[PDB]
Amino acid sequence: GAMAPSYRVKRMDIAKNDEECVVNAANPRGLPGDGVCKAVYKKWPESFKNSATPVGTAKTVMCGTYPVIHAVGPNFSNYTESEGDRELAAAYREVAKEVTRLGVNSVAIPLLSTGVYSGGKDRLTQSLNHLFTAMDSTDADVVIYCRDKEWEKKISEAIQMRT
Numbered sequence: 001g002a003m004a005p006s007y008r009v010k011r012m013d014i015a016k017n018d019e020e021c022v023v024n025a026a027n028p029r030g031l032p033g034d035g036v037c038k039a040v041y042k043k044w045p046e047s048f049k050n051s052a053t054p055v056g057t058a059k060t061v062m063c064g065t066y067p068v069i070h071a072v073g074p075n076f077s078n079y080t081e082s083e084g085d086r087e088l089a090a091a092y093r094e095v096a097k098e099v100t101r102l103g104v105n106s107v108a109i110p111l112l113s114t115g116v117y118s119g120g121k122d123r124l125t126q127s128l129n130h131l132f133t134a135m136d137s138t139d140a141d142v143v144i145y146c147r148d149k150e151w152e153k154k155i156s157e158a159i160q161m162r163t
């Protein structure tokens, strides 16, 4: 575990992370995809061997010795708000299990279902609160990666609020 487990946020490409493992915002079919998923495919293509897994689950594949945790959030274009919320919570619980199993002291994580799976809605708060519910009982240093300058401020504020 980390000596004083923390949450941090960085605005940069998760493919350049400084953590002991990475969470991919995966599709269920283990396809290269776009956004976070395509950057992850370009950096760790070996991790996409038999990475396909259902919605609400996480599947780890090693790229050398570096773990890639493929976490499949719901596409809110297809799910109801209620069912989507349940699957988004579940995907993060499966990430917490994998992070624990791997024995890593740090993890880079994107906000699941906030991009092309968002169904055109702002899900920063919904996705971040499910991230916290899952990861609060783990002792890994968590570093959340985002792209948008206003999202960085709001994630930083949410972390600071609970400290």
Ligand SMILES: c1ccc2[nH]ncc2c1
Residues within 6 Å of the ligand: 011, 012, 013, 014, 039, 146, 147
């Ligand atoms: C992908 C490419 C460039 C980027 N700059 N900040 C976040 C990010 C993600």
Ligand SMILES: [Cl-]
Residues within 6 Å of the ligand: 011, 012, 013, 016
């Ligand atoms: Cl970058």
Ligand SMILES: [Cl-]
Residues within 6 Å of the ligand: 025, 112, 113, 114, 115, 116, 117, 118
């Ligand atoms: Cl997404």
Ligand SMILES: [Cl-]
Residues within 6 Å of the ligand: 146, 147, 148, 151
């Ligand atoms: Cl973002």
